[PDB]
Amino acid sequence: APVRSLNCTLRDSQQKSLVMSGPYELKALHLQGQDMEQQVVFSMSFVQGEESNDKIPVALGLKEKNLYLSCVLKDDKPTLQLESVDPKNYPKKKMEKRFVFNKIEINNKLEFESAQFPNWYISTSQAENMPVFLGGTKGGQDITDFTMQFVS
Numbered sequence: 767a768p769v770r771s772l773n774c775t776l777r778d779s780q781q782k783s784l785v786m787s788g789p790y791e792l793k794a795l796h797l798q799g800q801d802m803e804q805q806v807v808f809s810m811s812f813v814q815g816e817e818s819n820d821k822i823p824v825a826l827g828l829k830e831k832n833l834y835l836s837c838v839l840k841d842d843k844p845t846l847q848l849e850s851v852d853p854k855n856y857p858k859k860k861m862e863k864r865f866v867f868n869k870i871e872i873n874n875k876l877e878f879e880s881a882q883f884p885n886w887y888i889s890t891s892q893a894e895n896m897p898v899f900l901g902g903t904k905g906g907q908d909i910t911d912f913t914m915q916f917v918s
């Protein structure tokens with residue numbers, strides 16, 4: 767049947783919000799009140815891939831945009847990018863591996879591991895207005911835990 771998707775926002779464990787701030791750019795910053803309209807709304811699709819109770823393969827598209835988070839090698843490093851797709855063909859259940867994240871529930875938080883690059887995670891910095899990047903450890907100064915808010 768059709769791929770199933772939910773609208774949602776994400777916040778890092780320091781309660782920073784994600785924003786489209788530049789052509790293909792996601793950054794994280796502290797937001798509250800009127801400025802919260804600026805946050806990115808995701809369409810989280812539940813896609814094909816290896817699955818367990820606490821590890822669920824998803825794709826993260828921007829709501830009603832043909833843009834997806836994806837993991838590719840750039841200048842020889844696993845990186846996080848926003849990638850445009852053919853809007854006639856997306857979302858789909860069999861998303862290509864660069865678009866797949868394992869959504870992992872640990873201690874009431876979520877982590878998003880790259881399916882393509884094991885043990886590389888969607889991450890945010892301590893500091894305000896830095897890239898949303900792919901980080902090669904769920905351990906240190908960088909933030910790899912999030913909460914999800916469900917949106918209408």
Ligand SMILES: CCOc1ccc([C@@H](C)N)cc1
Binds near residue numbers: 790898899
């Ligand atoms: C989701 C990707 O967001 C990015 C934000 C910033 C940058 C640098 C290159 N300006 C790269 C990606």
